[PDB]
Design a binder for this molecule. Structure first.
Ligand SMILES: [Zn+2]
Ligand SMILES: [Zn+2]
Ligand SMILES: [Zn+2]
Lengths: 846, 38
């Protein structure tokens, strides 16, 4: 027989082929072969259900579809399935793999006795052998759960997005879990901007023992109360009183301390670790983890189970016993408990073979070697003996004041040996062995000034931790949430920290007001739990979908109504005194999907009195200083102006090289604005950075009726070049003869000759649409020699054919910045080229 | 001509060599072939 195994990745195909062999043919079904419709390719409801594909009213008929370019793979798979006798669906463990397997099954057909569903948590010889030995049936319940999730997300996206376009702005999007993540980020932004840092001082003391050892302490009580001076003068007075006073070590405390290793990684823990230690965010972490799994070195990277197989435990215990030895074993395995709702059938993220060191990963990029090293170190650590520390605490008294030191010294290191700390902590030091009731001699003392930390801005990993705490989303979702909140323009990530765009605040407020049930964290968690119940087969998918859809439709039909009826409030204006360059009027501050901008109230006046003039802002970037550490965010908050009408901080924008604009955090709910010539941090336009040959200024990339094009930033220069098929920058035009006699082949347009730094090329009169480009032939140029400008005529003089009679083409040598002509046969270069050396054509072999 | 009496030699200060030069050359091109012009 020949048995066909269908696997999503090609790398997964290669790795599984390593262990399957000659009896099995492995075919890589790249991605989702079958998906709901995307492109355009009571009639309003009909068009809505055709756009969705899903029809919620007619019992969720789905109209799945197979996307452009999948059909080739579908044909190949069908042919192989006709050839093969048993078809093996070896997708990944999770619901996405089950959905892919179901799609494959349904396309190929023959369902009942021709499909085996293979389930392995690692691509290794023993795991694959055990998986193929007894294959499973396709678990339709998990497929139904995945379909339910997909249907919910498409229902919410397509039904909400036109509402947001009408009320707020075109080019918005919405999503069930996405909106709740944006709500989390916006709530933290509001907590931060509300915060008003207090000020507190601290004093530090330097002391020597009678035995000449040296000790440094911190001062924490005055008059038996907490020591916390409010101002400089108070601190200086305290320092004086301290210096005058005489010090004695009235307290001597000691105690052992133990530290246990961390649990083996679940996906959220792996993302947090990779962010903190290696700096990888979410996308890079999961991409490298997927590569490491597909290569076969680590277990499946979507898990919330800390469980480990007996095989894993025995392997790692063997490794510890052999390398480290008995002191680091310890006597019995370190158990770790995952959530009761976790996929306890799954394993943790662990090495597939503990002896494979990270350096040995010849075929993994260095970042993936680092991620594997992190996984390996954690896995080894988790089973080792706890570290052992002994700790000393000292308190010293002088006058009205008491001052403290704490120190720990490290005496067995077992798990810390494999998994060291990134840096020494404040308590990772040696306090000298002062006696109980010892004496001390004194050295000069230092004050310090501090401002209370605001709540810390989310990192990608700390947002994933927050989601994991609340129960919003699941291990497979987290990377998609973190990506989509950025891609959709409601949140931006900078300094590895999350910042919330004003449009995210507007949309968050509107969605909270209208769709309070959808946006509430508890109902999101309960929905996720109900999908988990579906996957358990505790619940019926269509049922919960109907319940969701009924509630959602009630809330939508309420929300659609007029604002006086109680629907979604419009994007209300806030108004400021500035003169519109077209009509001088007062100007107001506005938010669009593009950003935050300055608009003139004539936009709301009918055509007769309409004004479309707009002014375009650049926000000040916060530049957090890594060297300031924990201070870096606090000082950023200190840097901001504060609104006159309210305590909320203000956010800053640049309107002229002479002028700068401050806007309140609760805009447009708060209407405070400030204008100042003083100019904090500034930015500008970008795109393929090109140099304008006409004025030497910077040239940027812009699109529109000219589609992909490049225009110079100088207001005195309107020079424009164009993007072509296979070149960067943008040859301008100079010779944009609309050669009507050369027709396009992929479209009905006609070719036009353009010039630029890339060279001389032919492009469709509709590059924005046709975007069809090809290099001209010498015979083609000779056909239309007359239309060529005076300079380019030399190209027409170049020899049209090589000595072999093949046809020539005009090319641009970037290393020499000159045009030449080269011949090609069968699409490959013939190796013959002619250049123009001193008024004659030097032809020769390349 | 210059009626020098002796010859002196020393290391070249960068300001001195920059003072010698009547310009900086920044690109590898040598001579045009379309017209024999630099
Ligand atoms: Zn105006
Ligand atoms: Zn305000
Ligand atoms: Zn220019």
């Amino acid at each position: 027989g020949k048995a066909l195994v269908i696997v999503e990745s090609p790398a997964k195909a290669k790795t599984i082929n390593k262990y399957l062999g000659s009896d099995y043919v492995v075919k890589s079904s790249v991605g989702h072969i079958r998906d709901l419709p995307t492109s355009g390719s009571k009639d309003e409801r009909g068009a809505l259900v055709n756009r969705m594909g899903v029809d919620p009213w007619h019992n969720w008929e789905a109209h799945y579809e197979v996307l452009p370019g999948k059909e080739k793979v579908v044909s190949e798979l069908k042919q192989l399935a006709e050839k093969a006798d048993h078809i093996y669906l070896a997708t990944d463990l999770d619901r996405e793999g089950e959905a892919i397997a179901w799609h494959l099954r349904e396309v190929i057909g023959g369902d009942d006795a021709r499909y085996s569903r293979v389930v392995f948590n690692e691509i290794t010889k023993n795991a694959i052998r055990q998986a193929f030995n007894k294959p499973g049936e396709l678990n339709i319940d998990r497929v139904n759960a995945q379909q339910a999730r997909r249907f919910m997300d498409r229902v919410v996206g397509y039904m909400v997005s036109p509402l947001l376009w009408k009320k707020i702005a075109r080019g918005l999007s919405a999503g069930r879990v996405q909106s709740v993540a944006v709500r989390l980020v916006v709530e933290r932004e509001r907590e931060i901007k509300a915060f008003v840092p207090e000020e507190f001082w601290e004093v530090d003391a330097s002391t020597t023992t009678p035995s000449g050892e040296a000790l440094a302490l911190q001062v924490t009580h005055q008059n038996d109360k907490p020591f916390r001076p409010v101002n400089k003068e108070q601190t200086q007075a305290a320092v004086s009183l301290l210096e005058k006073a005489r010090y004695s070590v009235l307290e001597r405390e000691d105690k052992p301390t133990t530290s246990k290793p961390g649990a083996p990684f679940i996906t959220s823990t792996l993302q947090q670790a990779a962010s903190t230690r290696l700096g990888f965010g979410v996308k890079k972490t999961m991409m490298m983890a997927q590569r490491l799994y597909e290569a076969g070195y680590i277990t499946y990277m979507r898990t919330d189970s800390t469980n480990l197989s007996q095989d894993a435990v025995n392997m790692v215990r063997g490794y510890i016993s052999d390398n480290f030895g008995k002191k680091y074993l310890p006597e019995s395995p370190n158990q770790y408990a995952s959530k009761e709702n976790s996929q306890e059938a799954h394993e943790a993220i662990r090495p597939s073979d503990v002896n494979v060191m990270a350096e040995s990963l010849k075929d993994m990029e260095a970042d993936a070697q680092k991620l594997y090293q992190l996984i390996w170190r954690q896995f080894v650590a988790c089973q080792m003996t706890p570290a052992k520390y002994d700790s000393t605490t000292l308190t010293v008294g002088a006058g009205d004041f008491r001052l403290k030191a704490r120190g720990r010294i490290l005496r067995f290191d077992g798990w810390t040996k494999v998994m060291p700390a990134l840096r020494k902590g404040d308590e990772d030091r040696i306090l000298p062995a002062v006696n109980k009731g010892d004496a001390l001699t004194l050295v000069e003392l230092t004050p310090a000034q501090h401002f209370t930390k605001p709540p810390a801005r989310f990192s990608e990993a700390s947002l994933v931790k927050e989601l994991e705490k609340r129960g919003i989303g699941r291990p497979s979702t987290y990377a998609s949430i973190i990506s989509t909140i950025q891609d959709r323009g409601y949140v931006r990530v900078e300094n590895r920290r999350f910042y919330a765009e004003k449009m995210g605040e507007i949309v968050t407020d509107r969605l909270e007001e209208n769709f309070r049930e959808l946006m509430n964290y508890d109902f999101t968690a309960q929905m996720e739990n109900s999908l988990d119940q579906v996957a358990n087969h505790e619940a019926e998918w269509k049922a919960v979908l109907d319940h969701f859809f009924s509630d959602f439709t009630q809330q939508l039909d309420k929300a659609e109504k007029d604002p006086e009826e109680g629907g979604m409030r419009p994007n209300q204006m806030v108004l400021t005194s500035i003169d519109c360059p077209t009509c001088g009027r007062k100007m107001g501050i506005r938010t669009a999907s593009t950003g935050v901008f300055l608009g003139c109230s004539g936009y709301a006046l009918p055509p007769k009195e309409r004004c479309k003039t707009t002014i375009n802002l650049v926000p000040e970037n916060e530049v957090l200083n890594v060297l300031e550490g924990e201070d870096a965010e606090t000082n950023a908050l200190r840097a901001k102006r504060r609104c006159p009408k309210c305590g909320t901080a203000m956010d800053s924008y640049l309107i002229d090289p002479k002028r700068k604009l401050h806007v309140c955090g609760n805009n447009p709910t708060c209407d405070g604005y400030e204008i100042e010539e003083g100019e904090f941090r500034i930015k500008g336009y970008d795109g393929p950075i090109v140099e304008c040959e006409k004025c030497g200024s910077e040239m940027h990339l812009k699109m529109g009726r000219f589609g992909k094009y490049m225009a110079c930033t100088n207001e005195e220069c309107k020079n424009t070049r164009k993007i072509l098929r296979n070149g960067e920058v943008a040859p301008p035009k100079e010779d944009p003869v609309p050669l009507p006699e050369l027709p396009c082949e992929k479209s009905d347009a006609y070719f036009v000759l353009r010039d630029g730094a890339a060279g001389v090329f032919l492009a469709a009169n509709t590059f924005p649409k046709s975007r069809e480009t090809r290099a001209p032939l010498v015979e083609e140029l000779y056909r239309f020699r007359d239309r060529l400008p005076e300079k380019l005529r030399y190209l027409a003089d170049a020899p049209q054919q090589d000595p072999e009679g093949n046809k020539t083409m005009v090319r641009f040598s970037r290393k020499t910045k000159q045009q030449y002509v080269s011949s090609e046969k069968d699409g490959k270069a013939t190796g013959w080229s002619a250049f123009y050396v001193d008024g004659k054509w030097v032809e020769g072999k390349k | 001509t210059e009626e020098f009496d002796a010859i002196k030699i020393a290391l070249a200060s960068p300001d001195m060599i920059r003072s010698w030069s009547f310009g900086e050359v920044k690109k590898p091109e040598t001579i045009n072939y379309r017209t024999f012009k630099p």
